[PDB]
Design a protein around this ligand. Structure first.
Ligand SMILES: Nc1ncnc2c1ncn2[C@@H]1O[C@H](COP(=O)(O)OP(=O)(O)OP(=O)(O)O)[C@@H](O)[C@H]1O
Length: 372
C-alpha cells in the first residue's frame, strides 16, 4: 500500500511534496509563469496554467499548459506535471531504431485511411503484460510528429512521481478515451449516476460550486468491459455568462476519483475557454443522448477495484486487458529532465473521440454489447 489517497489525489506522495521535488525540472523546461486562474470563472474551482519558452524552427515564443484539481496545490502540480509530460515527449533522435528486430503490426494501432504504413522510425518499448520488448512507430510515441502514420496525439502521455505511477495514469487515460469513443458511437447514454452516497465530500463540494453558479451537472456512466469506472460530467451553464454546454470525462479504478476527475475536467475546459449557441435539432440530439436517461445508479453500484497499491492496481489492469484480448500493454520511458514521463500504448484501444479518422471494425460490436 504505497498510495496516499488523501483528499482528491491518488499518488505515492502529497502534491505539495511533488511540487517541491520538481523545481529543477521546472527551470530546465524554461517555465516563465505559474498563475492561478480560478477567479476567471464564476465556478471557483482551482485551475492553473504554466507558460514556458519554446523554440520552433527559429522563431521563439510561449507554450501554455493548464492544470485542474479540487484544491490549489493539486491544480498547480497538475499544470507543472502537464508541462513536464509535454516537454518530455518532443522527439529523441537517440531513442529511434531503423531496422526493428521486433516490430508491432502497425495495423493493431487502428490506422486512418491515409496512413503511411511504411514506417521508417521505430522506438523500443516494453510490453508489461508479456514481459517483452516490442518496437513501436515513433509516430505512436512522440508528440508533435510529422503525422505520416497518423496524426500526432497526446493520448497515453503521462508524467508522475515514479514510472509505475506515470504508467498507471497513462493506462487510465487510454481506457478513458477508448470508453468515450464507444460512447460517441452509441445512440443514447442511458445510465445516470446519483452521487449522493459519495464517501469523499469533495464530490458534493464540486457539484455545489457548479449549482451555485447556475451550472447544472449530470453524471453518466461510460464504464466499459474492464470494470474500470469511466464517468462523464455533463454541464449546462444557464447563467448570463457566455459558456453553455461542456462535458468532461474521468477514468479511475476508484469510481469517486473518476467522478472528481470528470468534474475538474469541466472546470479546466471552462477556464481555458474563458481565457479567450447550438442550433435546435443538434441541441435536441445532444439532449436525447447526453441529458435524458433510462436508469440511474448510485456510486455504491459501481465497481471499485483500487487497492491503493501501484503494483496491485497495474496487475489488476494488466489482467483485465489480457482477459478481454487486449494482449499488450506497452510503455516507453520518456524521462528527459529527471521526472518520470511515459508513453503508454495499448493496441486495439479506440482513439476515435480524439481523432475521428481512427476507428476500428471492432468498435461497433463493443458498442452493441455495452449499450444497444
Ligand atoms: N499529484 C501529482 N503527482 C504527479 N503527477 C501528477 C499529479 N497530478 C497530475 N500529474 C500529472 O500531470 C499530468 C496532468 O494531470 P491531470 O490529471 O491534471 O490531467 P489529465 O489527467 O492529463 O487530464 P487533462 O489534461 O485532460 O485535463 C498527468 O501526466 C499526470 O499524471
Amino acid at each position: 500500500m504505497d498510495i496516499k489517497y488523501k483528499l482528491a489525489s491518488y499518488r505515492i506522495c502529497s502534491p505539495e511534496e511533488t511540487f517541491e521535488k520538481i523545481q529543477e525540472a521546472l527551470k530546465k523546461i524554461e517555465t516563465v509563469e505559474i498563475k492561478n486562474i480560478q477567479h476567471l470563472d464564476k465556478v471557483n474551482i482551482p485551475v492553473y496554467y504554466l507558460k514556458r519558452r519554446v523554440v520552433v524552427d527559429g522563431k521563439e515564443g510561449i507554450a501554455i499548459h493548464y492544470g485542474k484539481g479540487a484544491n490549489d496545490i493539486q491544480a498547480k502540480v497538475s499544470a507543472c506535471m502537464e508541462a513536464i509530460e509535454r516537454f518530455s515527449a518532443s522527439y529523441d533522435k537517440n531513442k529511434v531504431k531503423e531496422k526493428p528486430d521486433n516490430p508491432i503490426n502497425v495495423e493493431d494501432l487502428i490506422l486512418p485511411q491515409y496512413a503511411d504504413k511504411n514506417v521508417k522510425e521505430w522506438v523500443e518499448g516494453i510490453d508489461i503484460i508479456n514481459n517483452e520488448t516490442i518496437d513501436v512507430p515513433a509516430d505512436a510515441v512522440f508528440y508533435p510528429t510529422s503525422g505520416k502514420l497518423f496524426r500526432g496525439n497526446t493520448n497515453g502521455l503521462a508524467s508522475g512521481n515514479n514510472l509505475d505511477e506515470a504508467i498507471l495514469h497513462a493506462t487510465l487515460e487510454i481506457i478513458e478515451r477508448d470508453a468515450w469513443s464507444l460512447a460517441d458511437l452509441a445512440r443514447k447514454i442511458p445510465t445516470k449516476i446519483n452521487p449522493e452516497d459519495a464517501k469523499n465530500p469533495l464530490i458534493h463540494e464540486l457539484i455545489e460550486k457548479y449549482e451555485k453558479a447556475g451550472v447544472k451537472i449530470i453524471l453518466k456512466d461510460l464504464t466499459s468491459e474492464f470494470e474500470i469506472p469511466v464517468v462523464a460530467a455533463i454541464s449546462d451553464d444557464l447563467s448570463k455568462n457566455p459558456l453553455m454546454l461542456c462535458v468532461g470525462v474521468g477514468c479511475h479504478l476508484h469510481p469517486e476519483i473518476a467522478i472528481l476527475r470528470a468534474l475538474t475536467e469541466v472546470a479546466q475546459s471552462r477556464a481555458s475557454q474563458l481565457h479567450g449557441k447550438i442550433p435546435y435539432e443538434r441541441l435536441k440530439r445532444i439532449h436525447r443522448k447526453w441529458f435524458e436517461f433510462e436508469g440511474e445508479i448510485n456510486i455504491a453500484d459501481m465497481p471499485n477495484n483500487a487497492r491503493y497499491d501501484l503494483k496491485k492496481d497495474l496487475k489488476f489492469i494488466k489482467d483485465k486487458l489480457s482477459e478481454f484480448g487486449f494482449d499488450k500493454l506497452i510503455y516507453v520511458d520518456l524521462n528527459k529532465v529527471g521526472v518520470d514521463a511515459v508513453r503508454v500504448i495499448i493496441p486495439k484501444m479506440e482513439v476515435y473521440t480524439i481523432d475521428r479518422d481512427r476507428l476500428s471494425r471492432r468498435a461497433f460490436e463493443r458498442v452493441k454489447k455495452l449499450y444497444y
